[PDB]
Design an enzyme around this catalytic site. Structure first.
Site, mmCIF file in Angstrom:
data_model
loop_
_atom_site.group_PDB
_atom_site.id
_atom_site.type_symbol
_atom_site.label_atom_id
_atom_site.label_comp_id
_atom_site.label_asym_id
_atom_site.label_seq_id
_atom_site.Cartn_x
_atom_site.Cartn_y
_atom_site.Cartn_z
ATOM 1 N N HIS A 47 0.799 -1.207 0.129
ATOM 2 C CA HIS A 47 0.049 -0.145 0.091
ATOM 3 C C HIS A 47 0.820 1.218 0.251
ATOM 4 O O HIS A 47 0.183 2.289 -0.006
ATOM 5 C CB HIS A 47 -0.911 0.150 1.191
ATOM 6 N N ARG A 72 5.839 -6.519 3.843
ATOM 7 C CA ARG A 72 4.713 -6.689 3.376
ATOM 8 C C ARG A 72 4.946 -6.836 1.901
ATOM 9 O O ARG A 72 4.884 -5.688 1.343
ATOM 10 C CB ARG A 72 3.370 -6.056 3.943
ATOM 11 N N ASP A 86 15.749 -12.751 -0.443
ATOM 12 C CA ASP A 86 17.346 -12.648 -0.768
ATOM 13 C C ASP A 86 17.786 -11.480 -0.677
ATOM 14 O O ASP A 86 19.051 -11.332 -0.155
ATOM 15 C CB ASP A 86 17.439 -13.324 -2.363
ATOM 16 N N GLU A 151 -8.085 -11.292 6.414
ATOM 17 C CA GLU A 151 -8.747 -10.000 6.286
ATOM 18 C C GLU A 151 -9.672 -9.869 5.226
ATOM 19 O O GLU A 151 -10.176 -8.821 4.757
ATOM 20 C CB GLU A 151 -7.709 -8.911 5.993
ATOM 21 N N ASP A 177 -9.285 -3.698 5.597
ATOM 22 C CA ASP A 177 -9.692 -4.933 4.672
ATOM 23 C C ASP A 177 -10.789 -5.808 5.136
ATOM 24 O O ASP A 177 -11.799 -5.939 4.470
ATOM 25 C CB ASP A 177 -8.693 -5.883 3.972
HETATM 26 MN MN LIG Z 1 -5.345 -5.119 4.405
#
Ligand SMILES: [Mn+2]
Ligand SMILES: [Ca+2]
Ligand SMILES: [Ca+2]
Ligand SMILES: [Mn+2]
Ligand SMILES: [Mn+2]
Ligand SMILES: [Mn+2]
Ligand SMILES: [Mn+2]
Ligand SMILES: [Mn+2]
Lengths: 253, 253, 253, 253, 253, 253
Positions: A47, A72, A86, A151, A177
Site C-alpha cells: 500500500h 509486506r 534474498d 482480512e 480490509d
Molecule cells: Mn489489508
C-alpha cells in the site's frame, strides 16, 4: 559471520511487540522511524509505492538499529517472496491469505528445497551477506518468520485450517480490509466487526500462533494489547506526518 | 501561457504567511506537506540531503497545490542560483548573507543581463516551461522573489546596508545560526538573542522589507507574528515526523 | 585497451560537425538522441537538471553510438571539471569564459600535473576504464578537447587574448547569453548582434581555432555553416519535443 | 541517544587502521565492502561519481557494520563540508590542502560557531539523528575527525605549517597526485618519490599527528605500516573488481 | 478536500478527447507533455520502462496541469491495479482483455469490498491524499474510470460479451496488437484490419460505451474522430522526439 | 539501421562462450564487467535486486562493449518477458522451467503474433530503437535467443520433452537449485549431483541444443568445457568483489 538473529520471531513467544507502519517508501524516512525505538517497522510493499530496490534501501537503513524489519509484499507471489528473502527480509507479512493451501504455499515459498520452493541464490543475496554467513543454506529458515493476513470472509471461513499450518508463525488481522469485506467499509470500530476481531484473536492464541493487528486508535490498540495480541502496530508514518503538520497549522491558520 | 504568479511575493505586502520547512528531501514527502495548506514550503537545499534534481521533483510535486515553494540553496553560489531558477524556483532564500555587496551579487544572480548575471537558457528551462511561456525572458523577474538570511554577527554588522539593497524582497533571521554566532549555541530562547531578533525584525519592517523567521516554539512564533513578521515558518517536517512517532510510542513504551 | 579516440577533436580540422543539444537530462532520452546520427551531442550540465551521476548515465548511453559526447559543466569550476573528466567526458564546453587567465586555468584543469592541475585518480575513473587503458596517465590529454564559450561583453573584450591560449581547441558563441549581454535579450537575430557574431567567427578561424555556435533557426545555422563554422548545434531536444507535440495537437485542436 | 562514537578518531592514537577505498558509488556495493572487516572505508566524493545523496546511502549501508566511514569531498569546499557533516560523516579527508591557512579554514568548517563556521541545522541532520541525540550541538566536535591531504609541491612547501594547525588529526599522503606533481606521473614507486613520502610520514608522526596513505602495492603498504603510519588504505574496490574478473577470465580466455 | 474530479471520465459522454502516448518514462518528460494541452496523457506501464514509482513521479508532474492522466499497466494483474489506484491513477487502460469474465475481474479490481476486490489502504494512498480526502472510501469509485483493450482475435470473439459488462467505461482498440493477431503485423492500414476496426468502433458506441484508439497516422485518426470515437491518441512522445531530431538533421545531413 | 546481431545466439553452434554473472545490479558495475572481455554477461533479474529500469541501465552500459548481454527474469512471467524484450534484451534465461508446455509458452512469449504472444509496441521499444530499425517487426525473432533452466526434479522428469521444443536454443543447468532439489543443498560437488549434471549435458547436446552452466569451481567449469558445454559462466561479480576484498585484508589482518 553468524546469521542475523530474528529477534521479532523470538519475541513472538516472550513479549508484546509495538510496531510502526512505514509507508514513506525511502531509506531516509525508514531511518528516521528506526531511531524511535519501535519493536518492529512494517515496510509496506502492498500500500506504499515500494519495489524490491526501495525495500532494500529501507532494510539497509533500519539494519543499524534495534527495530526489527517486517516486509509486506504486494501479494503472496512466490517469485516476489524469493526476491524479498534474498535482499535479507527475515519476516514477511503476506496479505489476503484465504486458505490452508495458500498458507502452506507461503510456508514453502520461505524454505529451500527439498522441503520448500525458495530459489537458491546465496552467492548473490544480501540475505547470506554474499556467502559471508558461511552455513546460510543450512540455517536460514531458523531466522525466517512467516506471518499471514486474515482480512476477508474467505480468510475467516478458513481460519481454523490456516491455524493448523506448521510454519505460519502469526496471523495478522487487517481491520481496513476486513471491515470492508463485512460491508462496514471505513467503519472497523463497529461492534459487529470488533466482536469478530476479538474472537479471531482468541482463536489465533488458542492454536499457539502469534496474533497481530494495526490500529491507529489508541483505545483499540490498548484493548488488543490487554487481550494478549503479540504484535500490535499503533500508527502509520504517512498518517503521523500529515496529522502533525495539520495540527501545527491549525494553531496559526 | 502566462508566467506562474508568485503569490508568496505578492503576499509579502498584504498578509502574514505561515511556512513549513521541508527537509525530507523527496517528491512524495513534499506532496504530503503540500496537502496541509501552508502559505509556503521551504525546500531546504542547505540542511537536507537535496540536489538540483531532488528539488526539481519537489517543485513538480508542490506545483499542483496552492502552497508556494521557496528554495534555500546550500550557499549564495551564482551558478547554483542559475540552476535553481531554471528548474522554476521563483523564490530563493540565500543563507549567511553578510554584506550589501553580497546581497547585490544575489540580486544580480536572479536577473538576466544586461542588468544582472543570470545565465540565459529559456529553451531548456522548466522556468519558461521550455518557451511555452512566450515572453518569459522579458517578464521573468516580475515573479522572482529574493530573500536573504541575516544569521551572523557580520550580517548584523551590515544589516542597515543590506536593507538598502533594491531587489532584496525580504530578510530572514536564522535563530540557530545567529544564537550560535552570539555564543548561545542551541539556546536561541535566551533574552540576549531574542532582544537582538526583535530589534532586527523592527529594522527590517522600518526599511519597508519583509521580515521572516523559523521557530518551532509556538509562543515565539506567535510573538513574531504579533510583531508583524511577514513570513514565519512554524515547524520542520523531519522534527514533526520524529516527535509524532516518539510521542505515539511513549503511550505504549 | 587503447584510449577512446576523440573523433570530435580530430574533425575540428577536417569537417563541419552538426550537433544536437541534450537537455532531457536522462540516459534513455540521451540514447534516443544518439540513434539519430548527429556528429555531436551536447550533454547540458549548465541549463538542464543534470549532475555528475546523470551525466555519467548519458555518456554510458551515447557510448554505443558514433555520435561524440560534449559536456557543458554549470561553470568553469576546476573540481567539477576533474569529476566530469574522470567519468570519461573527453570534450568540455566551459560557459562564460571572460579572460585569457580563465581560459588558461581551464586548459590546466584538463591536464595532469606537473603541467596542469587535473587531480589524478585513474584507478577509479571510467576515463581510464579503471586502468584497463594501460598508459592512460601518459596519453589522456591527446584525446581531451577544451572548448570555451564567449557570450559576454568581457568575453568579446578579451577575445584576441583567449584566442592566443594554447590548449583552447575551440570558441563557442552563445547567442542567447551574448544577445542578452548586448541589451537585445531574446532577440539574437538583430543585425547588431549578428554582425558581432559573424566578425567573432571570422576572428576565431583566422587565429586557427574551431568556431562553434547553437542556433535553432535553420537559416542562421546554414549561414554559420557557409562562413566555415566548425561545430554547429542546429536544435535542442526539449524544444523539438515540445514543438512536435504542439504542432501535432494543432492538427486536431 | 548518545553521539555515535568515532572509533576511527580514537584508534589514531592506539592502533594501525587498515582501509579500503570505496569508489563503486552505491549503497549496495558499500554494504558488500562493509562486511569484509576493514578498520575504515573511504567513500570517495573526489574520484568516484558520488554526490551528497549517494554518500548518504553508503553511510546508511555501512552504519550497521563495525567498519568506520571516512568521506573524501571533491574539494575543501566549506558549504559541501557542512552538507557532508549534516548527513552524519564523522571523518573527512580533504584533498589538495596546500597551506596552514587552508587547513585552519577546514578546521573551522568542521566546528560550530562561535569557534568555527559550520552551519547549524541539527533539527534536519542525520548527524544529530534529527535531535534524537539530545546535546548534539554541545558535543558534536568531540566525535568529528579532520584529515587533510598533502599531495602537491605547495603542500610539501607548507608541511611544517600545516602540522602546527590544532584540529588537524591526520595528514594523508596521496602518492598518485604527489608523484604527478613531482614529474613522475604514474610512477610513485620511484626512489625520488618514495624518499619524500618516507620523510613526510616521519615528520607527520614527529609533530604528533596521524600519518595516512593509500597503496595498492602490498610491499609499499607493509613498509608504510613498519614506519608506524596510523591509517593505511591497501586497495580500491573498483581495482579489485576489475582485476579479479580479468584474472578469472585469463584461466579460460 | 474533495476527491479530484475525473474530467476524462465525465468527457466520455460529452466530447472527443485527444490523447498523447507518454513512453519517455520520467517525471520531467511527462511534465513537458503536460504543457501541450492534450485532453489526456497515456502513461505507458506496458511498453515503456515504467514501474509504480516512475508512474507516481509522472502522475505528480501532470497533476499541476489540466491534461488528464491514464495509466496502462503491463497486464490485468489485480495486485498491480491496486498499487496503481493507490498512487492515485484514476483512469486505467487494461491491455489484452479477452473475455467478459476477465473484464468483470478488472471492474472488481477497481472497486472496494464488498462489491469488488480492491485492497483497502487509504491511510497510505496518494489516492486519498493520505486521508486528507475525508470520505474517500465511500466516494472513490465515482471518479475511477476503467477502460479495456480489445486487440486479439479472442478479444473480438468476446466483444459483445465484454460490451455488456457494467463498469467497463470504454473499449480501446490496439491496431498494433490487433493487426499482428490478424496476420498483418506492422500493416494495420490494410483494408481487412481497418474494416474490422470500423465495425468494432460502431459496435462499442451502439452498446453505449466509449470507443478509443491510437493512430500516429493523421488521416486514420481524423477518420476515427469522424466515426465519433470518444478517446483518440494521435501520437507518441518517443516517436515525435526521434522523428523531429531525424527531420532536423536531414536539413543539414 | 539493421537489427543488432545476437552474436551469443550465433556462437551457440560455433564456439564455447565464457560468461560472468552480473548481480551488482547497477549500470556502473555492469560497465566495469563489460570491459573484461567475457563472451557473455548474465544480468540477474532473479537473484540480484534488479527491476526493468535497472536492467535497461545495464543493457545501455554493456551495449558499447563486445560482451553479449543475457537477462534472467525473476520467473517465466509472460508480461515481464515482453517488458525485457522491449528494453532490448535479445537473450533471455528463464528460471525453473519444468515442462514442454511451459517451455513452449516461453517460446511464444518471445515471438509476435500471430505465431507467438509477445505484445507489439515497437514505436516505444529500445528493442526497435523506437522504429529506427525499419523492418524490426518482420525480423526481430531472428536475433532473439531463448534459454531455459532445468534445475528441479520435475525439470529433469520432463527433460526429453523440453529438448523437443522448437525455439528453445539452450538448456542451462542450475547446480545450486538442482543440488537443493536433490537433497544436496549447498553441496553440488557431490558425485550423485555431478553424474546427473554430466548425463543432462550429454542429452542436451545429443538433441542438438546448446548446454549451459554456472560454476565458480574452476575444475568443474573446465570439466564442463571439456564435455563440450556451449555457454559456461565461471564466476559472479558479487562473489569476486567480496572474495578479493577478504583475501586482500587477510594479508594485513
Ligand atoms: Mn489489508
Ligand atoms: Ca543526484
Ligand atoms: Ca524501481
Ligand atoms: Mn541558518
Ligand atoms: Mn550561454
Ligand atoms: Mn589525490
Ligand atoms: Mn497493444
Ligand atoms: Mn537457479
Amino acid at each position: 559471520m553468524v546469521n542475523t538473529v530474528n529477534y521479532f520471531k523470538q519475541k513472538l513467544k516472550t513479549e508484546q511487540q509495538i510496531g510502526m507502519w512505514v509507508g514513506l517508501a525511502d531509506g531516509y524516512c525508514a531511518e528516521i522511524a528506526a531511531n524511535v525505538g519501535y519493536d518492529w517497522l512494517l515496510i509496506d510493499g502492498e500500500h506504499a509505492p515500494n519495489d524490491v530496490r526501495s525495500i532494500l534501501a529501507q532494510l539497509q537503513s533500519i539494519a543499524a538499529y534495534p527495530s526489527q524489519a517486517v516486509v509486506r509484499p504486494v501479494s503472496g507471489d512466490v517469485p516476489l517472496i524469493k526476491q524479498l528473502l534474498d535482499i535479507g527480509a527475515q519476516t514477511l507479512l503476506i496479505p489476503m491469505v484465504e486458505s490452508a493451501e495458500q498458507a502452506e504455499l507461503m510456508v514453502k515459498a520461505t524454505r529451500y528445497p527439498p522441503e520448500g520452493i525458495r530459489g537458491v541464490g546465496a552467492a548473490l543475496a544480501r540475505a547470506s551477506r554474499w556467502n559471508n554467513i558461511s552455513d546460510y543454506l543450512q540455517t536460514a529458515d531458523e531466522q525466517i518468520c512467516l506471518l499471514v493476513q486474515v482480512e476477508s470472509k474467505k480468510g475467516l471461513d478458513n481460519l481454523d485450517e490456516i491455524l493448523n499450518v506448521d510454519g505460519v508463525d502469526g496471523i495478522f488481522i487487517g481491520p481496513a480490509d476486513l471491515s470492508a469485506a463485512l460491508g462496514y467499509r471505513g467503519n472497523p470500530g463497529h461492534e459487529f466487526v470488533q466482536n469478530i476481531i476479538v474472537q479471531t484473536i482468541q482463536k489465533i492464541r488458542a492454536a499457539g500462533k502469534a496474533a497481530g493487528i494495526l490500529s491507529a486508535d489508541e483505545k483499540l490498540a490498548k484493548q488488543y494489547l490487554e487481550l494478549g495480541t503479540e504484535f500490535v502496530a499503533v500508527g502509520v508514518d504517512t498518517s503521523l506526518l500529515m496529522k502533525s503538520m495539520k495540527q501545527l497549522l491549525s494553531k496559526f491558520k
